[PDB]
Amino acid sequence: MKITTWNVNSLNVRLPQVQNLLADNPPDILVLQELKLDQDKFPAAALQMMGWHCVWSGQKTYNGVAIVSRSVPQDVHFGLPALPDDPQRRVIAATVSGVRVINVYCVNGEALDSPKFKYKEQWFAALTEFVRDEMTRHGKLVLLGDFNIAPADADCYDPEKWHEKIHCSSVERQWFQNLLDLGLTDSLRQVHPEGAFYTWFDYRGAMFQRKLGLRIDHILVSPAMAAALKDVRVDLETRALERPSDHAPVTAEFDW
Ligand SMILES: O=P([O-])(O)O
Ligand SMILES: [Mg+2]
Ligand code: NA
Ligand code: NA
């Protein structure tokens, strides 16, 4: 089984690339963040007509998350029970081929002194509660997406420049640890304990061409999935395309 997560930085813009990714060596499940499309503007026909089932949660301009799979997604769930009236479209879950898939587009946070950083804190607390509950029922569970958190200094290029800055702060790293502490494994680091595996590269300054990025897109797995884990890779071919998303897809492959 292959599961890919990709922050597409607008699905309107990236649709042809999503289509090309589904057409050649496709994953079994592709989850998307930053649709940036209202619910009724999601290109459902374009993907469905390719033989893919889609569930999604969109809003105008911002955010937006989708799950795309050749299996029909079951028991679809939207949002966070502990933050039930947040209008921001950031969490969608569904059971796909017996695996509980929770797709997140986590709060960026902006800056440690931004009011959006307090939002980030409360939002992560709410996510932890939902994930903890979901894990009591599904032995095969995958929590994946753009976490907007770089777990350790190997995940932030030039770590001295990012010392207690957004994405790379000690407190953000604690929020990421709180998810692992539920009984989940950072899949990429199980397979590749050492080395840079950046998933986001700023468009400004040609950072992708300079190899300078953050590892903020992750695939967190329950033990039953960890035991079956074969590889985790960052799809830099897709990031190297003309007019790319600033994030690269990340794929985990499971082998039983
Ligand atoms: O969705 P924002 O406008 O609060 O960033
Ligand atoms: Mg973006
Ligand atoms: Na933004
Ligand atoms: Na790669």
C-alpha to C-alpha distance for 207 and 196, rounded to whole angstroms = 14
The helix/strand/coil state of 124 is helix
Residue 158's alpha-carbon distances to 18, 88, 161, 192, 212, in angstroms, are: 31, 32, 6, 20, 8
**DSSP alpha helix (H) spans, 49-114:** none
Pairing state between β 250-254 and 99-105: unpaired
Distance from the alpha carbon of residue 226 to the mean position of ligand 3, in angstroms: 33
198-217 per-residue burial string, b: 16 or more CB within 10 A, e: under 16: bbbbeeeeebbeeebbbbbb
Alpha-carbon separation of residue 88 from 57, 61, 97, 107, 230 (angstroms): 9, 11, 28, 9, 34
The active-site residue out of 105, 167, 186, 218 is 105
Tell me whether residue 34 is annotated as binding: yes
User: Which has the closest alpha carbon to 79: 52, 58, 108?
Assistant: 58
CATH number at residue 151: 3.60.10.10
Resolution (A): 1.9
Which two structure tokens, joined as six digits, stand for 29?
């499940």
Method of determination is X-ray
Per-residue three-class SS string for 27-43: CCEEEEECCCCCHHHCC
163 carries an active-site annotation = no
Which single residue is written with the structure tokens 């397979």? 191
> How far is the centre of ligand 1, averaged over its atoms, from the C-alpha of 107 (Å)?
10
Q: Could you give the CA distance from residue 117 to residue 86 in angstroms, rounded to a whole number?
A: 15
CB 126 within 8 A of CB 99: no
Nearest of 144, 250, 153, 147 to residue 194 by alpha carbon: 153
**79 close to 47: Cβ distance less than 8 angstroms:** no
CA proximity to 112, closest of 163, 177, 161? 163
Q: How far apart are CA 67 and CA 103, in angstroms?
A: 7
Give the Cβ contact number of residue 174 at 10 Å: 12
Q: What is the number of helices (H) and of strands (E) in the chain?
A: 8, 12
Backbone angles phi, psi at 141, to 5 degrees: -140, 135
Tokens of 43: 């290109």
Do the annotations mark residue 28 as ligand-binding? no
* Active-site residue identified among 62, 75, 146, 181: 146
Rounded distance between C-alpha atoms, residue 18 and residue 58, angstroms: 17
130: helix, coil or strand? helix
Q: Relative to the alpha carbon of 191, which ligand is closest?
A: 4
User: What are the residue ranges of helices labelled H in the chain?
Assistant: 11-23, 44-48, 115-135, 170-180, 187-191, 207-210, 223-226, 236-239
Residue matched to tokens 């009236």: 85
Cβ contact 176:168 at 8 Å = no
- DSSP output for 42-106: S-HHHHHTTT-EEEEE--SSS--EEEEESSPPEEEEES-TTSTT--S--EEEEEETTEEEEEEE-
- Tokens 């795309």, located at residue: 68
Q: Which of 247, 250, 251, 252 is nearest to 34 (CA)?
A: 247
Token couple for 165: 């800055």
Q: Count structural domains, the chain.
A: 1
Q: Which two tokens stand for residue 112?
A: 């440690």
Find the domain containing 124 and state its range: 1-256
Q: How far is the CA of 163 from the centre of ligand 2 (A)?
A: 23
Residue 247 counted as an annotated binding residue: yes
The one-character DSSP state at 247 is B
**C-beta separation of 247 from 7 below 8 A:** yes
> How many angstroms separate the first and last alpha carbons of the chain?
9
CA distance 202 to 214: 9
Contact 65, 35 (CB under 8 A): yes
Six token digits for residue 18:
């999503």
> Which H, E and C letters describe 142-168, residue by residue?
EEEEECCCCCCHHHECCHHHHCCCCCC
Active site residue 38: no
Q: Which residue has the tokens 């963040």?
A: 33
Spatial CA neighbour of 230 closest among 202, 193, 188: 188
> Is the separation of the CB atoms in 38 and 76 below 8 Å?
no
Name the catalytic one among 75, 133, 247, 255: 247
SS3 78: strand
Residues 199, 238 contacting (CB under 8 angstroms): no
Task: Examine the residue annotation and report whether 77 is marked as an active-site residue of this protein.
Answer: no
- Binding residue per annotation — 148? yes
Q: With contact defined as beta carbons under 8 Å apart, do 32 and 103 qualify? A: yes
Q: Is 173 helix (H, G, I), strand (E, B) or coil?
A: helix
| 108 belongs to an annotated ligand binding site | no
